[PDB]
Design a binder for this molecule. Structure first.
Ligand code: NA
Ligand code: NA
Ligand code: NA
Ligand code: NA
Lengths: 83, 83, 83, 83
């Protein structure tokens, strides 16, 4: 929703990508550009992991009343995590 | 346990590693050696994924009677998956 | 420099991150958000790879006159690639 | 060749895989099994990296007399590294 910390994290990566575009415009050292691009990649990776973790924790902690349906829901969610 | 398919998969990788040792003894082309080592890596990765998936599915489908304790058990198990 | 295709690729990822921010604002399905974030991650990965490849190809094809210094230059560049 | 340290490293991983097979036979904790399998994966990854690095360093330091052919040889070798 509106104030979510994942919006803020991705807005940081968005701005960093703009900075990296300038580094390329300026023929900056490939190593600096790669370092910064790797940081953006790692930040995106971290957001993916935290979003999946939040989704699964919500699944677990907001169960369906039907315990059998809840198992199947959790199973669909975990095999998504692992893959 | 005794007849588990993951033992068999890892015994395949064990034998493949022996073959790769021979390729190195024989100064075989680095590309062939790397291809085979990558296959072993991928097989180990696959066993990791299937073992985690089995463990979490067993968690889900063999719950504790205490539903609150079961949630905490699943949560400990999923954050292990994601990380 | 000014018109580089890597600027354009990263500007695409920048815009996609803005779209993903909206998906989070809108509590869109985690799976859709993760799919899109993974695409951004993969695009950043691809830019990293192409920038390193370009840098090493330029190293190789614009050698120093001193062949021994050029070897050391290439070696510093390849161990950067592998790591 | 005969005494190569990469044979020894892979023989360590081979033996570790045998140990992990026993852990599975014994229904050891998934987390211990995964930790050990991850170590094997990381060791295989490290051997891949060191073998590629050695191959490229040998390319660089044992050039063809034909400098143009040597460039093409290095280029084929680096794009293999990056990919
Ligand atoms: Na949150
Ligand atoms: Na099994
Ligand atoms: Na270019
Ligand atoms: Na060696």
């Amino acid at each position: 929703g509106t104030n979510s910390k994942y919006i803020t994290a991705l807005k940081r990566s968005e701005g960093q990508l703009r900075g990296i575009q300038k580094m390329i415009e300026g023929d900056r050292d490939c190593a600096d550009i790669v370092t910064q691009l790797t940081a953006v990649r790692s930040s995106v990776e971290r957001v993916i992991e935290m979003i999946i973790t939040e989704a699964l924790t919500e699944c677990i902690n907001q169960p369906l009343d039907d315990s059998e349906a809840q198992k199947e829901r959790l199973e669909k969610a975990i095999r998504y995590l692992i893959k």
